[PDB]
Ligand binder design. Structure first.
Ligand SMILES: Cc1ccccc1Oc1cc(N2C(=O)CC(C(F)(F)F)=NC2=O)c2ccccc2c1Cl
Ligand SMILES: Cc1ccccc1Oc1cc(N2C(=O)CC(C(F)(F)F)=NC2=O)c2ccccc2c1Cl
Ligand SMILES: *Cc1c(COP(=O)(O)O)cnc(C)c1O
Ligand SMILES: [Mg+2]
Ligand SMILES: [Mg+2]
Lengths: 363, 364
């Protein structure tokens, strides 16, 4: 496996102009440098390279292009109020990427060495980490089969690469723009016995049609429904949280359980940790159905619904389109107090306004 | 709109590769001299199609095909006939499935007849690669990828359609039936209701490499894909599944899982159902089949034959299934296999021009 100490660094000779962080479309702007590491079954891992952002030269038979032999990660670097650049629980992203590689039959790698190569890449491109407490640098580790063979088989050739892409505030305002969700049980993101709990590329290609349908019906995101009971699972790419009075008349923060169809998000685990620590209401990893939700709405038992994930720390939901009717969620009329408290706490940690075990200052 | 075959730009190779031995071909490892490429953008639509020397693709590392599996493929064969005429077999069915897959993937649509004509011109230029052997063929791999330089999860605004050619030998190097052992583990599910299992989208396959490694680790050649609480038998690896048996009503029946969203509508599957209907010798049912249906039938000596069918292996007899830690024998090879043999003879006769058919086209 490759070592950070073997890094070959070829710096760019011409640096690009940085974007205005308030005029950023997510994932369209890339920094000056990338990380690449070649693997073959014959010779193993090559030395890792930090070099100028470049096209990949791939055999057209590359299994990544034919059988989605590919996975990715997503994590952020934050420029702190103290001007220290922090990662946020990056070891968890390395753990999930390694597990996904095993599931994909891509070759395994030393997680500590990859994280150190990523830190060296971000350090070289550190002026791309935005000077704004509502912006960040998105880190995209990517892992593709480059086997020049149409056989459906474990690849004997692979490329691990990392891209950097600055992201502005999810909300152009700076604060909350609630989303309308499209809930059509016709589409299923992930199933029991599937790969829904991994960031394998194949989990996402199947979802574009549902998102186009959402947009066609004036919604911003898909509400992913599962099973005959229409369980509510994920808000687009984000974990789903419901703050309500439950069936027992108890104040409760509820989120679907990790049963294999849910991506175990970093922010999801943090929010559960915070909600347990505060001890002010019940915290349940439990199934939630559309019928649970509409019954609760009829009883004025719903306070807040929000997504949480890498894309958006906290994304309030105002409406769900379901069985041809618009269902209003009163999140924005209830503060949103919990959503606001969670956003404040996580951004305070991310931007170093308070100490945390959850952050690491860049190498 | 669409690219047009009449706009084809042909850049011939000046240096040609040595043709491989038709008796010594490993699937998908040898590529011909030329490829087809067609660029698309939302801004300007389809660019002119190019036949040029086989080359690496130059892709932005942000290309959505690499991140979100914004990709699909097809698989079809050209056959050098006993009369030395090169034939395609039901290629319009592959064009129909590719168009439908593009729509489901949010990739741009194209004219199926224009693509088929571009494919014919590519095969014609590389026609000496169509093996001189009645057990070998030229595999045609149309591929369609998002090349959008953006990490946003979105309909692509940039795409590439390309076609590779690769000669392939007999599925069984001997040239005869070698029955397969199947690994049936309900822990893995290939496809779900509301998924893309009925399309050739790349994302359907990436999940399956791990399961095949497990099959091989337990001495099996293929995965038997199980679905649902009742353990429905769906597909034999990348192949459609056929069961020739006496059903619960005591009737001779050819059964195959129905197209309810989790089954690829194979070209071979379509041909076999067409033949079985045409012959009118037994009941033909698209119906659910569970492991319990199968083991009940085996206990009653009601099973005659089980086989996979797909472009890979026209007819692949099944001898055994490993399920709940026991090896379950299927008596396919003790019953001829008569139906499997009849189907193999019919389809290979048509493919190699030993008989005329509506199902074949002689190359442009
Ligand atoms: C390529 C493809 C992709 C998706 C659907 C069908 C396809 O067509 C195949 C698949 C093959 N295949 C494997 O590549 C591996 C495989 C394993 F044993 F690993 F399961 N089984 C197989 O049949 C083939 C094997 C030998 C000759 C032809 C094959 C064709 Cl044409
Ligand atoms: C990229 C990714 C893939 C898988 C999981 C998380 C990911 O991270 C995202 C995803 C985004 N995203 C879309 O790109 C499209 C999208 C739609 F509306 F189309 F569904 N929703 C989204 O959240 C983001 C949108 C804006 C700013 C950041 C995003 C991040 Cl960091
Ligand atoms: C391609 C494929 C088949 C076989 O279909 P044909 O068109 O007959 O080759 C069967 N199952 C799956 C999953 C496939 O991808
Ligand atoms: Mg080590
Ligand atoms: Mg029984």
């Amino acid at each position: 496996t490759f070592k950070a100490k073997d890094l070959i660094v070829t710096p760019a000779t011409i640096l690009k102009e940085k974007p205005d962080p308030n005029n950023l479309v997510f994932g369209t702007v890339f920094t000056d440098h990338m990380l690449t590491v070649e693997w073959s079954s014959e010779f193993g891992w090559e030395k890792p390279h930090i070099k100028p952002l470049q096209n990949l030269s791939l055999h057209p038979g590359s299994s990544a292009l034919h059988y989605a032999v590919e996975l990715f990660e997503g994590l952020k670097a934050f420029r702190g109020v103290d001007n220290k650049i922090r990662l946020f629980q990056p070891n968890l992203n390395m753990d999930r990427m390694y597990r996904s590689a095993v599931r994909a039959t891509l070759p395994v790698f030393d997680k500590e060495e990859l994280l150190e190569c990523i830190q060296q890449l971000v350090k070289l491109d550190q002026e791309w980490v935005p000077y704004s407490t509502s912006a960040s640098l998105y880190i995209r580790p990517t892992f593709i089969g480059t086997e020049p063979s149409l056989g459906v088989k474990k690849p004997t050739k692979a490329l691990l690469f990392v891209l950097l892409s600055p992201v502005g505030p999810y909300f152009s305002s700076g604060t909350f723009n609630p989303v309308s969700l499209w809930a059509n049980p016709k589409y299923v993101r992930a199933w029991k016995g599937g790969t829904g709990d991994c960031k394998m590329g194949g989990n996402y290609g199947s979802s574009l049609f549902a998102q186009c349908e959402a947009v066609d019906n004036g919604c911003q995101q898909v509400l992913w429904l599962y099973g005959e009971d229409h369980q509510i699972t994920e808000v687009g790419t984000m974990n789903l949280f419901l703050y309500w009075i439950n069936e027992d008349g108890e104040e409760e923060l509820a989120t679907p359980p990790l049963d294999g169809i849910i991506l175990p998000g970093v922010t999801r685990r943090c929010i559960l940790d915070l909600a347990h620590q505060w001890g002010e209401f019940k915290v349940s990893e439990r199934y939630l159905t559309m019928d649970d939700l509409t019954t609760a709405l009829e009883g004025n038992r719903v306070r807040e619904m929000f997504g949480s994930g890498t894309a958006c720390v906290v994304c309030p939901v105002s409406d769900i389109l379901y069985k041809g009717e618009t269902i209003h969620i009163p999140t924005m009329e209830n503060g949103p107090k919990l959503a606001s408290r969670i956003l404040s706490k996580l951004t305070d940690i991310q931007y170093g306004r308070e100490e945390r075990d959850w952050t690491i200052v860049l190498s």
